Amino acid sequence: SRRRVVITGMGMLSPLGLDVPSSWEGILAGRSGIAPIEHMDLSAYSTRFGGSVKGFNVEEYLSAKEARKLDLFIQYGLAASFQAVRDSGLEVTDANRERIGVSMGSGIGGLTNIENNCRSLFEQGPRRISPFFVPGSIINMVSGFLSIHLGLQGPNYALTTAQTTGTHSIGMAARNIAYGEADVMVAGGSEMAACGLGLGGFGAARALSTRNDEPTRASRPWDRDRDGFVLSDGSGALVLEELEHARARGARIYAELVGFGMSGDAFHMTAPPEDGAGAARCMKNALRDAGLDPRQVDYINAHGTSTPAGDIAEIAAVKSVFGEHAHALSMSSTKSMTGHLLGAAGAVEAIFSVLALRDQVAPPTINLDNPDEGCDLDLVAHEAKPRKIDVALSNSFGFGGTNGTLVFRRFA
Amino acid sequence: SRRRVVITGMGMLSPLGLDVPSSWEGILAGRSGIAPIEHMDLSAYSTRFGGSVKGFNVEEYLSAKEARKLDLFIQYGLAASFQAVRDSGLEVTDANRERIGVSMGSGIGGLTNIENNCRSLFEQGPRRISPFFVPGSIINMVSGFLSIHLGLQGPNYALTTAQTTGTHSIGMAARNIAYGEADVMVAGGSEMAACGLGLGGFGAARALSTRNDEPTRASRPWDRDRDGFVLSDGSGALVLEELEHARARGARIYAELVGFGMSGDAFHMTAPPEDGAGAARCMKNALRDAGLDPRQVDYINAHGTSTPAGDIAEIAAVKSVFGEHAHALSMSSTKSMTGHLLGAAGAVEAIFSVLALRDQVAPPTINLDNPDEGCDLDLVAHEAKPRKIDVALSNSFGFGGTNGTLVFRRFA
Ligand SMILES: C[C@@H](O)CCn1cccn1
């Protein structure tokens, strides 16, 4: 019968910090992690900035020998996973290793490594492709490498659902625990899409902000002057654990995961429907799964991408789901500060939602100077808002019309 | 408690055929789908052959214009998915569309597209990258395009667990139905990694057979002269359906999906442990999940990739799990004929497992001329074996030590 699931550990690399506390300090201070990209020459590109992880030292985690074989998205996902496992205090033993699994996902995976090997193939020949090309690039190898390093023998998989990946990863990992397939899961996502193919491919779709001359103001969810998403890198990981398992070992519990929703839009390969119908279906599924009155929702960490169509679809979905209560809850987009971590967005934002519960504060939507037509909810413009938060919801929406919603609540 | 899950539709593209019945006729005849790869200069490569899909006409499924947007692996997954839904006879309606979802995955995804867009980026710069590069390449677009085309609003996601993808996709879709999150799921996987990067990437790891002189004899699982796997393309899709839902509409039921196992080896990035400990745990988990004794198993569709370490690990796992029943079951590798479809392997092999139950016949392991040391099980060498089959397993073992097992049972 369905077990309860709590959060006992969290880990992060983001454009605001090399761990959770440093990132959250930046979130609550309204700080932007966005800057001109330094790691490559983008003069031929329409977008030349994004949210880089600054000063990442892989030798805090892995030998230089192993790090050299692994795409940055794997290095970032292992960094966040190791932080989360250490934060949990959990000791892996022969008695429990078969009951601990991992579900760390990515939207795009090891595009930097694939591009660099493609360069070798075309400039030199196939004999110069790395022997580590496949295991160092493919998306399931955060789960694989974490399992090898920590001895995790539970369910071992990876989701790839574009910008919904981190939220789906955490929800499905929670279902694994709820249904008794595991007692502990490390779940979340990682992304490092800031290579020519990533910036070029999103640039070709004209999906990205082109505010090159003022990168910290580019990400402006629900602002009338928004012009697309800001591409960002990093990772979030959470240790999910069955409630009685956590209680038995005296774990510190940050919050309980009470609800998860999925829905498909079935509308368009890339565009969200203007009325947010799929997002509304998804939230309603999540609230019913959590056994809640929608009026219990205090805080929503929106997807809030800073796209014209995305941001207004989310307002429409929240109004449809919450009715008059839409005007009482607080909703913010932390992408205003972090940018869009794609398959890691739902993972870092789940962590921000749990910290909103721990600290009783709604993170701001920075850059919300002139709310657009109909964007008239409490969007926590400019500055963090201390408030009562018993229930927090984190939404994600992606290409393919794929939607996820997580519902967290205070645990006493 | 849990609902029962049955298979009511199947669809496939393989090196043997452009549908299930053509592919299956090849399987029972012991035919190879392996040949030198055409319309591609592989002079500089150590492997020049594989399993291609021959004569695929995407305009049976999509307009030319929609097809131009999508990588071949997405085209192949949509072909299998549309076939499976047609084969099921299911009528999607406003009354059931929120109860029908999709989980079609891929191991490596859009390599061909990445390679072609790399060419443009390196030669001409980012302004020649296609606008559809991202949504036409990412792994969740089979699920996305299928949901949009058929109006499916249920759970919409995509797994990527390397060579385990198709098995995990089917198993987790079965969990969705069993636990009441959906009544119908389209599940499986697709792959087209025959590009410079795929042949070059596996080649650099010296993982591929290099038997260029006799491609049809390259894939020789458990044979003492095997020298690595054969890379193959295609797709498999199954319609999974809650039993009472199938019975109410008069569905044709092929078989019941009674068990699903997952485990992680936690051993090595690409190699299984010599004793197949992880594969043994995974099969034991799948049998416990089905409430079956190892002695009830009649037929195993092996992962059976034709790698030195993989093939011998599976023999050890089967001996461990099955004890004095290990010789009574029949175990065959259909990869002897199809080669290794990577993330689609588990999907086409679940279909072959279901058809082994329908037709009471174990498919052959072709090329098994000289069984290796300790390879003394009933490996169905050379020729199909009519036999009693009530319970059939299908195993997948992938990079990162990720394991999956499905258990199918005759339905009457
Ligand atoms: C001082 C910190 O960077 C330690 C990171 N860490 C290594 C394993 C788990 N957390």
Strand order of the largest sheet of chain A: 5-4-6-7-1-8-14-13-9-10
Spatial separation of the terminal alpha carbons of chain A: 22 Å
Number of strands of chain A: 14
Q: Please trace the helix and strand order of chain A, writing H or E for each element.
A: EHEEHHEHHEHEHEHEHEHEHHEEEE
Overall, the morphology of chain A is globular
Strand proportion of chain A, as a percent range, falls in: 15-25%
The share of residues in helices of chain A is 25-40%
The largest sheet of chain A is: 10 strands, mixed
Structural class of chain A: alpha/beta
Q: What is the count of structural domains of chain A?
A: 2
Catalogue the ligands.
Answer: (2R)-4-(1H-pyrazol-1-yl)butan-2-ol
Tally the helices of chain A: what do you get? 12
The gyration radius over C-alpha positions of chain A equals 20 Å
Largest contact between protein chains?
A: A-B, 84 and 85 residues
What is the oligomer described by this structure? homodimer
EC number (chains A, B): 2.3.1.179
InterPro entries (chains A, B): 3-oxoacyl-ACP_synth-2 (IPR017568), Beta-ketoacyl_synthase (IPR000794), Ketoacyl_synth_AS (IPR018201), Ketoacyl_synth_C (IPR014031), Ketoacyl_synth_N (IPR014030), PKS_Beta-ketoAc_synthase_dom (IPR020841), Thiolase-like (IPR016039)
Active site (chains A, B): 163 (for beta-ketoacyl synthase activity)
Enzyme class (chains A, B): transferase
